[PDB]
């Protein structure tokens, strides 16, 4: 029984395809296509009231978040490149995310290799 559906979540270390290859990222926003919304985690906030940035329910996409229709119905997850800076911090879904264990690595790691060797 693997438990894959729980290393994609709130702060999760997950892998993700950008392009033609998987990188490592932190997981800070969660997308369920179920209802539109998507689940967030509160840690690098300002402050707040209260419950405000401490309880984060499932929120509806923004007018500045509007997600790509091929990755908004897909559960996606709003991640931040870990090794680039959060001006890339991008949503990946099941589509392009998997999961960091040593068997996607494994394949990162020959990827990066590989579809950095590639020549045509």
Not at 66 to 73: A, D, G, K, M, V
Not at 91 to 114: C, F, P, Q, S, T
Request: proline residues 5%; glycine residues 8%; charged residues 30%.
């Amino acid at each position: 029984m693997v438990d894959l559906e729980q290393e994609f979540a709130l702060g999760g270390r997950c892998l993700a395809f950008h392009g033609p290859l998987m990188y490592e990222a932190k997981i800070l926003k969660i997308w369920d296509p179920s209802s539109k919304m998507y689940t967030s985690i509160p840690n690098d906030k300002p402050g707040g009231s209260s419950q405000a940035t401490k309880e984060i329910k499932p929120q509806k996409l923004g007018e500045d978040e509007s997600i790509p229709e091929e990755i908004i119905n897909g559960k996606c997850f709003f991640i931040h490149y870990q090794g680039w800076k959060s001006s890339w911090d991008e949503w990946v879904g099941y589509d392009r995310i998997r999961a960091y264990n040593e068997e996607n690595i494994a394949m990162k790691k020959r990827l990066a290799n590989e579809a950095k060797e590639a020549k045509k």
